[PDB]
Structure formats: C-alpha cells, structure tokens
Symmetry: C3
C-alpha cells in the first residue's frame, strides 16, 4: 500500500514513503531529501537462530564514489562500513530482549544528488522499514545530522555546508526525546556548543518520529508473534539468585581481583551454579540455564554500584584507573608511544610516508576512500592475544575500522595543514580491559609529538559507562550511576559505552553506544561533563611524559631531495615507460616524481634509503 | 590406458584422448583442436553428501588473458565464470536422480593457440572425462559453437571468424539428437537463421558423441554402484499422494493465490502431511519423507497443466503476466526505469562514465576482462530482500555475473558504436517471481532510451517453461506443454528455463537451461516461436511508456571540455608526477587526460562536477 | 615479570625479553637485534579441539615492505607466508603427542631497521613465548641464519651481507644439538661448505637455547596440565596389534601394490579391525579406536623397514623410483616438460612475458613482493584431482606458495642474468605420490632448456625420508634408516620429508621438514650425501631427454620491435592520456613502452600478436 509523508526541517523537507518498491520484504521504505533517495529493507526470519543471541546485520552499500560521481558498483569502502555501523547502533537497542531471529537490514542508494547526504536518509529508512514491518521493534527512531556553519546550527547540512562545518554530529532519537545513538566529529569545539547541538538534534528527531507514527497508523501494522522470546523464566532466575547471590557479591566486593582473577572466580560460581540448576530444573534448557546465571551475575554486579556507590575494583564512580605512558620506545620509528590505562595497553607508532602514497595509481580505486585531508590517517588493530584469545588476523574487520576511524577523528583537528609528508598513525591494542580506541587517541597524541608533528594541542579520550535501575512497569529510569573509565565487565554488564575525546579546551570526537532503548538528554549531558573532568586528568599525566612536539623530526626521518637531469640523459634516467624509476622505488623504497623537464623530486623514508637511491641514480 | 580418436568437423579436426595425464582422477580427458589443448578431470566421492542434493561444481580456469598472450596464473575472470556455468549446464542434467555425491569437474588449459577456442573443448572434455569414469552419467554429450560469417554457417569458428560473426551459439547435444544446453549471442538475427544454426549444431554434436562412444567402448568402462540413490520409495510416494493430492489440487486450482499465499498454502499441507508420514513410516527418514512430498506436489502441479491446459494462476499456456513500466524515476539519474512483470520487479539505471573508466591503470588486470566493445556493460544484482530472504551481499556471485552477462548481450546489438561515454547499465531485482534477467533486458532497453542513447531498436526478453509426461520405460516424451512467461514455481516444478530476448525483428540472446536429460529439437523450435509472440507483446506495452530515445541526454548529464595549458604553466598545472590531476579527480570526480602539449580534455559526470573542476583548475 | 638476557653472536648481540608487553597472552616475548625488534605471542585453548589433531597456526605479519620503508599495514605477502611456515616448522615438532588444543602464534614487527632481519628474530620469539608460557612444549629452540660472504661463514648476516651471500641457510636447533628445521637457498655451493654451514649454525642455536633456559629459570614456569592428551591407551593398541599385525605385514610386503591398491587394502583391514575394537572396548571412543589402528599400521609399516631393510614397494633404502620425462609437449608453449617419478607426475611450462610485467602499476603493491631478481619466477599448483580429491581451487594457498618458492630457489642459481624477457615457470602436479616440489624443480629445468633459456646447468631434487627406532625411556635414536625418494605413505608414517635440490656439482635448495623432536647432525649429513647420489641419478636420466638448451627460442616465441613515431603524430599515436596504447595492449596482448621522444619499444608475446599490433599501429 503506497503511503507517503513529508517532514519539514524546516529548511529542507524529508520525504518518507513505502509500498511501491521491494514489497516482498518484511519491511521496506524509501527516504528522500532533495534529489537523493535511499531505499531500506528489513528481513527477519521466523525460525529461531542456532545462535543464542540476536543476529542482526546492517549492510549499507553505495553504487558510486565521490558524491555519486565515480561509478563503482561494477567493482566495502570505509564510508559503507562506518555508515552500516551507525545504522546498526541506531536500531539495535530497540529490539526486544530474547529476539534470537536472523535479521538483515539492507540499503540501496536509488539516487544521489551530490548535495544531500544519503547516510542520514538510510538511518531513517531503517527505522521506517522496521516500523512498517511485522518485526517486533520498539521505535520509531528519527535521525538527523547537526552542523555548525559560520556560527549557526544547521540540521542535515548539505555536502558543501559540511565542508565548512566545525561539527559533524549525528543523532538518533526515540520517542519522549530519548537518545539512542550519538556520533560526532568536531573541530575541537566548546562543550556548551556541542551540548546545544545535541538538544537541537533531538528536537528534530521527534518531528521525524511524528511523521513515521502517521505512516504506521495509516498502514495498519500488526506485529508478528515470535515463536519464542528467549528470556529465562522468572522461576529459574529467582532460584539462581538464591544459589549464587552471596558468592557473586563476595567476588564483586573483593578489590584484590584483576580482570582475569575476577572472571575465573565468577566462572567457578557459574560451573557449580549451572549444575545445581540442571538438577532443580532438569526440564531443559542448557542455554536458558546459562542465560539465567548471566542475568543474576549482571543484577548482583549492578546492585552494588547502585546501592553502595562502589565499583567491583573499589573505585569511586568518577575515578580514573592508574595511567602511565612512554614515548620513543624504539630508535628506528619516526615516532612511538605506549599508553597504559589499567589493564588496557596500546602501542602507537607514527610513520611518515610520501605525499604520493595518499593516492593509488588507479583513479577509481582512489576515489573510493578518497584522499585523506591533511594527508593524515590512523590504522587500528585489536589482535586476539590482547584478550588471550585466538582469532582470524586476515581480511576486513569492521570493528577495527570503526575504532580506527574514531581515534583518527579524535586526533584530526589538532593535525597541522600542509605537513610535508603523509602522517600514518598505527594503534595496536596489546592488552585489553576497556576503551582501547580512547587509549589509541591518547597514544596517538603522544607518538605524534614524539615524531615532531607540531600538533596544536594534546588529545585524550575516555569511556563513560552507565548503570540504571528502571521500574518493571515502564522502562523509566528511577536511578542511575555514571562510571568514569569503565572496565570491560562494566561495559558488558552496563548500559552504554560512551567514548568521548578532545583537548583541554574542546571536544573532537564522540561515539555513544547505548544499550538501553534510549536514555534521557540529562544523562548524556552529565556523561559529557564527567568525561571532561577525566579527559583533563589524562592530559595532565600525559603532559608529564611529553608536553610539546619534538622540536625537529628524528635523525632517522624521511628526507626530500631535488635531482637535476638534463634532457640528454632523461631517456636513460627514466628508462622505457619509466621502468628505471619504478625499479628504483621497489628496490630502495624511495619515491621519485618528475617536477618538470629536468627536475625530479625524491622522497626517501630514511637517510639510508636516500643514500642507496643516490647510488642507484649515480650511474 | 592411452586412447585417442579424431572427429572430423569436417573443416577442422577435434582430437580426443585420455589415459596419459592425471590418471588418479575418477575420469580425465584431453581435447585438442589445432594447437589448443584442454584437459578436464572429474572426481566424485563415494560417500553420500550431508547435502540433500547433488553437489556439483565446475571450475574452468585459464592461465593467461587475451587469447593466451597475457600470463595471469601467478595472479575468477568473467570468461572463467561464464565458461564454468556453460559446462555445468551441459552436464548437470545427465546425472541420475538422487545422486547426492560431491562431484567436481576441473579444466586445465594445457595450451592455447589464440586461434581455436578452448571453451568448447572444455565442454567436450567434461563429457569424455565423465564418460570414461566410473561415475554414473547418462551421456555422452557433444558440443560445438556455430557462427554465421559472411553469410555462412561455420562450426567451431576461429577467434578471428568469431570477431566477424553475427552469431555466437553454443550447443550441447545428447544422443538421439537431444538438446541439453543452448547458449547464444546474436547480432539481432532472423529467427529462421537462428533456428537453422541450432539444427546444424545438433548434427555436429552427434558426430562428437559417436567418437566418444568409440572411446568408451575401447576403454571398457564399468560404472560404480553408488552406496544409494536418494529417491523416495514408491510406497511412501503412493501413500503421500493419497494423503495430499486433493488439498494440493485445490491449492493449484485457486487462481486467487499470489506467490506468497500459494507457497504458504502448500507448506501447510506439507507440515500436516509430513507428520502423518512420520507415523505411517516411522522407519525414517525425515529427508525421504521430505523428498516424497516434493515429488507429489510436483506431480499434482504438473498433471493439471497437462490435463486441463490451465496454470496454477489461471493463465493459458501462452499468456503473459500483466506488465507495467516507467522511466525517469529519479531526477539525478542519467537514465532509469522500473519494469514490472507479475510479481517480478527490476529497477534499471544507466550511468554515463568516462571512456577512460573502461580501462584500469594496471595493464594485466585490464587484459583479464578486456575492454568492453562499444564501451557498454551491464551489472546485475539479485539482493536477498527480493525473495524476503537474508543473504551475503559481498563477494563474487556467479549467478549474478551470468545473469548480468545474459541481459548485457541481449542489449549489446542495439547499442550504437562510438558513443562519447562509457555506458553502464545497472539492473537490480527488487521483487522476484520469475525471469529477472529478461526483465533486466526490458528495463535496460527502457532506461537506455530514457538516458538518450540512440539504440537502434527496443529489446525485450521472456522465459519459456516446459512440462512433460514421459513413459516410465524410456525417457521418451509422450506429451508436453510449453509455458509463456513462467512463475518461479513453474520453473522449479518445470523442465526448463528457456530465456530468450531480442527486438521486434530478430534474436539477440538465448540461455536455455534444460533440466530433463535433453529435449527434442521440435520442442525448442516451438519454444522459440512461442517466445517470439510474447516478446512482441512485451515490446508493444514497453513502447507505450517510451518508444524512442530522449532526443538529447538529460540536463544533469556528463560534459566534456577542452582546457588549454601553456608550457609555462604545465609543471604547476599537473604537479609532480601528475599529483594535481589525481587530486582533482578524487575530489571532484572529474577525469582529466592530456591530449597534447598544451591541451587537456576534461570529462565531468555532471555540470556541477565540471564547475568545481573549473574552479580547482582556475587557480 | 620483566626479564631480559643478551646472547652474544659473538659478532652481534641477540636481546631477548618478556614481561612488559601483551601480558594477557599465555606467552609473549620480544627479540631484538640492532634496532629491529619483534614481539611474538602464543595462545593455546584449554578446551579440546573438535579437531582430532593439533590445530596450530603461525601468523607472521609485517607493517611495511622493502626493509621497512614502504608502509603497507593500512592495506599476506610472500615473505609473510614463507616466514610463517618457517616458524611453524621450527616449533610444531616439539608439542606433545595428543595435544589437540587450538594454538596460535602471532608475530608483531615492533620496529625494523632495514639492516637486521626480523624473520630469524621471530622464530626465536616463538620459542621464548612458548617456553615462558604454561603451554606444554618440549624446547627451547634456538635459530640462526648462516651466510657465506666473500668466503666467510657469517651468522645472522645483515641485509647488505645477504645480498652478496652464496648461502641463505636458516637452522632451528633443539637441546643436545638436535636439528628441528633446516631451510636454505644457495648459489649452487659445495656439499662440504653447505654441511659446514649446518654445523656452525647448530653451534649458535645452542648458545641461544642457553640464554632462553636462563630466562625460563628466572621466570619460574609451571606448565598447565592439559584436560587430556589424546593418545590411545596401551590396551587398545596392544589388542589392535594382535588383531591386525599379520594382515598389515602381508599388505606391506606385497610389492605388487600401487598407491591406490595399497591404501584400499589397509583400509579394508581398518574397517574390520575398527569394528572388532568397538566391541572389545564398547567404552568409546571412535576417535581413539581410529588413533589406535593408525598407530599400529604405522608401527608395522616401520618395523619392516627397520628389520628387513626393504620398503613396502620392494625398494632398497637407496633406490629411486622409475623416472621418465618429455619436453616439447605442445607446439604453442614457449617451453614445456612432463616429469614422472613413480606415480608422481608434474607438468611444467615456461612462458616468456614482458620485462614490464615484473612490475605493477601501483608502486606500493609492487614493493610488497618486490621485483624478482633475474626477472624469474615459478608458480606451483597442486590441484585436488592429483590425489583423486575434491577441493577449493580459488584463493590463497599457503602450501602451494611454499612449494613454488622451494622449486623457484632450486632453479634460481642456474638462470642467466639479463635475459630479455621475464621468465615464468608454471609447475602443476597432475598425479601425486611423493615429492611434487622436487619434481617441479626437475620439470622446470627440462622446460627451461626446452624454451631455449641458456641455464648454466640442469637441476634436480629429491626427497629423503627417515624411519627411527627410539627407546621408550628417552627419545634417543637407537637405530634408523634413511629412504631415498619417498612414497606418500613413507612420508606420513615417516619421520621427515627432507627435500634437497641442486646441480651435478652443488646444492641450490633445501627444505627439511622434520617430524621428530629434532634429529642428530649425523643423520642430516648422511641424508644430504644420500640425496646427492639420487640427484645425480635423476640428472643422468634427465639429460637423455634434453641435455642442453635449445639453441634458439622457439618459432612461436616473443619478439621485441622498435617503432619510430614523429612528434607530428605522437598525440594521435598515444591518444589522450595514453588511451590508444592501453587499448592496443588489451586487444593484442602486446606491451608498448616509450623509449624516448620518437621511439616506442613493442614487446609481442608471439609473431601473431606483433602482426596484429603492427596493423593496429599502421593506421
């Protein structure tokens, strides 16, 4: 059934419709602004997943690069992966607990006008497809981007407006002005401006929700009745609580635990408990018995934070873990640093590469991820040994890409323009116990100064967590504790992973992963203020190992040199089709580029490389 | 045991041998023509597959590109995938029912002379390897390509002859002149010529079969006795028929069903039936009980078509489903169209790209798929939501490649030479109920006219299906119905998916996927004539939404502009090693190419891009 | 707990430490020499693998190419794969039997100085991580590279020293001077020099082991107690021996068996035996019953070699299998050969490609594998039909890469410098019964001569195997037989696959895969001498099919031609941005490169290609 509604920006209209395209899907929708149009579908199986969790995947795909100008579908980009993840975070929290059904959300860019951004359209598209579908989902959600252009707050800024915005904030909101997801990149802006952007953004999401609710009412939606919701019965939970509460409370009030000892201790309680349940309730099911212990471990864990204002390691609500750092770890590295916060350890390196390396030989491949502004990028890895695990170490890793992008944008505003080399930061998490991406931003800041990049200011980030008590009637929050710098266990037993970074004066990045079906604006405002205190604490300790850029780049650093070649010798110098230069580059790792008729510029990664190149060229 | 036979073309000899190479394989063969030689192997496991179907995979691989001139094995091409699929279709129908054994056919191009095509050799190679092996296979098959060069029918045309042929038809034949597989691309040729090519082709396959039969007789082949053939016992089938026939007949004579309601209705009968079987035959096996219901659903379904000359949706044997179409769906698209036939929906877009984009920066990668003639290509996608399913959306999809290639060749003959841009068609199946590839050809034709490409004539395609009654003695067809424009259900319960496309005056493409062990020439001749009627019907309705190309390209279309740069400024314009031009392209999506000393040509995808480029260049 | 030791070269210090980085891993270590530093981790699960074997994977990764100069981690290279495999072979033999626990070893290049090679550091790193971990592992191992530079034996030669070394030998040693792994590439050097390198290398490994033992003692290591070691009980083995010994002895003393008949015959004994065990020991476990028969089949098999000095096919300890070969298999191939040794068959082809093809258009991709010296490479494939199996035929295959590299280096020293084309050898194993890589070297030598490459001498290789009797007290070898040219079955029931290749006068390559926890130097010296005899025997039979290079390249061979283009016509010749040349290359498979202002060089793969190019250019 064709249906359509327009939502006023008010500056620009959002056109939402459904009922013409892809009508076999459980849900489908198209969202258009200007001449950009996105279709989103939602499909969810009726048979339970072999998984003992909800398998949800979001796939946002584009058909061309560079504002829809360079066709690419005939042949995964960064943009696609990051956009998929943003949509995922905007919808995941609103599925019912126990909904273990294979569910897929796909996005099709029907048309892109190079002016109106399709990413935000797709988030809204997912919301309306789910809303109009028979899939249980506690929405609707509405989403907008907020920019700050020439001093003004602009909703859903055009691509041109974005290029001069000091803010790239995306907000997804649920009814009653609850925040479901916050994603932002900012030019080191004032907390007060950042926070006002959030409130404006939320306002607009509520308008979009109103439009969606109209659409739902016209469509006459009847949700499916899932075969089963896999939540443990109140009986098995109550009993489990009886059996394990005292041991769990003991474990969680023992401050001498570290990550590993604490986990092994709850695991011991789990094994015993889980076997005593198997007997009391022989009527199956191992997975439900497993669910029950997790529910109880979680509740005991949280009740202590709520009742005693103490955390399982003895910290205050606002205390940072101990931090230590070092720069200049290894002599040959252009810059490096080790950043340790509690049992989270990341090693960061900077490497200067040629300006040329920011571009691939193939035009269309280049267009895909584009050329990094300031010729600056950060690559993040989370290898399996960081958690004493075994894992795949090849291929596309979406989480690593997302985390890298987060730490990259945290750092991006302090990077100088017109640096003579490409700046590559590598962040590698060697030990993991919470907020590796925020440690990557910190480590990156230290290594960048070590390397002698004159960054404008140091950068640090931290994760804020959340524990709530909500009435069983409505989902309404009757009490809550914000946690500074959360342990792994506080993330998984907690309600959010609110990662925010910036300088001593402003905010550069935010990624709020919220696991409740939305939270009040007041809670996120407080989270931001609380993180601001911790950030400054991290910066003070960071500034004691290094507080300004090395006054030059290191001895071992790259060098650029200009080489004159007379026409008489060009043909021999370059070789047929430039073969000599290509061979020179492969063999010495230098990068040569012809500047004019007689002039060639040589980038060498080290003085040793240049020497070797000077000898290969000295024929 | 070394054996060899030569089959006369008669113009060119086919040399078939076995017994020297890869003698561990269940079967092996080499086939040579001129100085091109192909080895094919066949391996089939003796233990049943966990699959409840026959797992058959064909892998044809080349070692170089461009007529064997550009080595590539040191590092999946289109050619490889399409060739694999053609071989698969030529052999798959001849395995016995219930043969659930992992089976792999591999092709090795021992040598390629750039004159004689290895693809056809490989099809024959697969046939002789299977024939000489202990693997149950009801062959032999013979295969030839038929060309039409300068007015003459030529069997196995050379590569040079192919380049001037108005026909590229491949036919695989079984004994008694049965057609197993038909694949063809034609320059919009007369039905009568196309049909004569088929008869000539079949004649030649029979000669090849005679040679293969000699080889088999000399070798002394003894087929294995499979552990079991997984066909349901006549007992369980007879009973199931008793239980379900009346409900199934009711469902299949209710014309008010649509795809989904019909499937859910037979599924309800399945659940009930399948539980009543479990009781009557508690002696296992769930899969056999499943097989039995499918056999019965199939037979009931087919008996109605045969006995009453009516189809499950109420159509005549020759009736098209309702069709509707639209062009100009979205303003920013260079061209677009939506084509709907029954519950099959595909969205087609055309996008003009630079001539340069038809070539990759890497020579060897370029050689692999080569440069598309007329700089024209079509990319097809069949996303999972088209059938309300969940699926992988990344990586190589062989079916999508095959379908795209089919719709591409359907359209290729009407495309003008020397168009100023690369023409890319995208076909996306949004709703699926039969013949998405033929809808892609139709949609492509509409979108191409929308975009203002002066194609010589409109193109449409359609699928013909088949239901036969054969005696249980021999496989001989005692009666049959050809079906115009088949539903999904008529494909899977049917005997073929015969997809043919062309213009009002001729044939451009054919892909006959035949599921019986071959069918008579007469049946395919009739299928072609019947499809000709439906094609023209589709064209008449298509011509009512658009019947000629837009008289110009759209407002938003690409533009080419010439830019003069004085030697004095070249070095600054281009930058070191052309860095500026590369950056310009990545940032604006324009494509610049130097024409001479002072002249640069700029391709811009839109006027907006060109403007931006004119400003980046206006420094 | 931070710990560190330095091991003197004595020329260069090896710095080994642990306890600062990645402290969650079961084991971790860093190894440094000069300013190159490598971290290695080891993780092993405590729960048994579903596998009925030890799942061990080694992943060595670099972050840049070309001596650490070209960053690549932002995006598997040959170097990475070959290095991973070398580390794997150095540690795998030292795990306890039955240790079926998922285990992963990862290597992180913390820093690379372009002087000291990280590969050898990583091997040592793996050894110390395992040693310091709670993972059962019978080490330590020590590893060094030995070079021969300007007449002197140099341990851990620098990258500069390696470039002028006539030897690249890596040795991994265990305590009491046992050799665990030998990997070497040599410039056709004297057996006596090669053997002395091994002894020097082993000496140095013992020094490294001493350092590691200190580290272990300081750390206070307590190994885990695995849940279970999956070795069959002596009871089930003793009984199985009773049941099957006589039939197994009969099968293994029947010289009329071939590979397939022998395997089917032991399999028949297995089926019967395995069912009689199920009864005698109904107390499970199928896998243990399976293990037991394999242990017994292995022991019976080996006892015959030991007691009777006869092998299961009737051969002497030192006898080669029958060999036959052929060159010039197919007319269009630049060179080709078929090499058959017993039931091992490989087809080798040579193809001349452009010098340009040794380089990719993308600089950074080129740097990754670099440019092959002498513009020579070998690509090896082991398709599934070679063993009558079904398998994946796409994607990265680590074993194929390793084997190709082995045969490549075997041949590399005899290749002439400054050949006018890239030389590509393809080796394809068509039938497999032992030592396919050594057959690839032999086949490559024949095909190279066939193709008219003036190689300095013929090359052959062969595999030596080993059967030992060791006391049950210590692992000490009380008796042993070296086997010339081993069957598949002698490899899997044997103690090593010692693959060595070279010319009549010297050694070019070695890959010793040893499956015992190290073997005495004396045994490898004897293996080398015994292989020397067989190599020369293979060379004598090879020289009877071809004993010198064809005096010219074949008729069909590539041609280079120089084409003069006047400035007046350049713009038209090359087209915009070189489009014409690119199109010419894609369409004819020729390769054009501009030599100067008016001169273009054309490489054509065949005279036919050149003709076509001369016509495309003759416009």
């Amino acid at each position: 059934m064709a249906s359509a509604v327009a939502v006023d920006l008010g500056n620009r209209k959002l056109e939402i419709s459904s009922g013409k395209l892809a009508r076999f899907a459980d849900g489908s929708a198209v969202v258009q602004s200007g001449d950009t149009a996105v279709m989103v579908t939602a499909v969810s199986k009726t048979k339970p997943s072999p998984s003992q969790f909800m398998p949800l995947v979001v796939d946002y795909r584009q058909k061309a690069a560079a504002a829809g100008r360079i066709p690419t579908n005939y042949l995964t980009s960064d943009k696609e992966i990051l956009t998929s993840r943003i949509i995922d975070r905007s919808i995941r929290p609103l599925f019912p607990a126990g909904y273990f059904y294979d569910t897929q959300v796909l996005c099709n860019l029907l048309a892109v006008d190079g002016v109106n951004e399709p990413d935000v359209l797709a988030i809204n598209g997912a919301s309306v497809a789910l809303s109009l579908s028979d899939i249980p989902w506690n929405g609707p959600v509405g989403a907008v981007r907020i920019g700050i252009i020439d001093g003004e707050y602009v909703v859903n800024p055009t691509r041109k407006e974005m290029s001069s915005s000091t803010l790239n904030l995306v907000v997804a909101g649920a009814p009653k002005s609850q925040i479901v997801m916050l994603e932002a990149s900012a030019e080191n802006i004032l907390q007060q401006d950042f926070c006002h952007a959030i409130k404006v953004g939320v306002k607009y999401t509520q308008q979009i929700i109103q439009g969606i609710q109209q659409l739902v009412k016209e469509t006459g939606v009847t949700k499916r009745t899932p075969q089963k919701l896999f939540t443990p019965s109140p009986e098995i939970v109550k009993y489990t609580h009886k059996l394990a509460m005292e041991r769990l409370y003991a474990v969680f009030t023992d401050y001498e635990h570290d990550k590993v000892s604490r986990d092994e201790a709850v695991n011991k309680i789990r094994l015993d408990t889980e076997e005593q349940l198997k007997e009391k309730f022989p009527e199956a099911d191992p997975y439900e018995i497993i669910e029950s212990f997790n529910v109880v471990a979680k509740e005991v864990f949280r009740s202590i934070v709520l009742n005693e204002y103490k955390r399982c390691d003895g910290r205050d609500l606002t205390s940072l873990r101990n931090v230590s750092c070092e720069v200049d770890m290894f002599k040959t590295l252009h810059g490096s640093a080790l950043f340790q916060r509690g049992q989270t350890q990341v090693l960061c390196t900077v490497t200067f590469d040629s300006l040329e390396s920011g571009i691939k030989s193939d035009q269309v491949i280049t267009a895909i991820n584009g050329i990094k502004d300031k010729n600056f990028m950060l690559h993040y890895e989370f290898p399996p040994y960081a958690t004493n695990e075994i894992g795949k170490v090849t291929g596309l890793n979406r989480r690593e890409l997302g985390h890298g992008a987060l730490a990259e944008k945290a750092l991006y505003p302090v990077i100088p323009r017109d640096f003579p080399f490409t700046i590559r930061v590598t962040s590698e998490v060697l030990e993991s116990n919470g907020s590796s991406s925020m440690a990557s931003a910190c480590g990156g800041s230290l290594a960048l100064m070590d390397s002698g990049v004159p960054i404008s200011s140091a950068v640090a980030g931290v994760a804020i967590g959340l524990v709530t008590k909500t009435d069983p009637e409505k989902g309404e929050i009757e009490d809550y504790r914000l946690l500074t710098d959360i342990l792994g266990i506080e993330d998984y037993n907690g309600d959010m992973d609110f990662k925010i970074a910036g300088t001593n004066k402003g905010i550069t990045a935010l990624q709020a992963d919220i696991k409740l079906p939305g939270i009040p604006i007041k809670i996120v405002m407080e989270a931001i203020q609380q993180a601001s205190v911790a950030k400054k604490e991290i910066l003070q300790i960071m500034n004691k190992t290094i507080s300004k850029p090395r006054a030059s780049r290191k001895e071992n650093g790259p060098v650029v040199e200009t080489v004159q070649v007379p026409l008489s010798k060009r043909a021999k110098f370059v070789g047929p089709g430039g073969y000599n230069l290509k061979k020179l580059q492969a063999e010495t790792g230098v990068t040569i580029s012809q500047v004019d008729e007689e002039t060639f510029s040589v980038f060498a990664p080290t003085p040793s490389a240049m020497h070797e190149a000077r000898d290969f060229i000295t024929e």
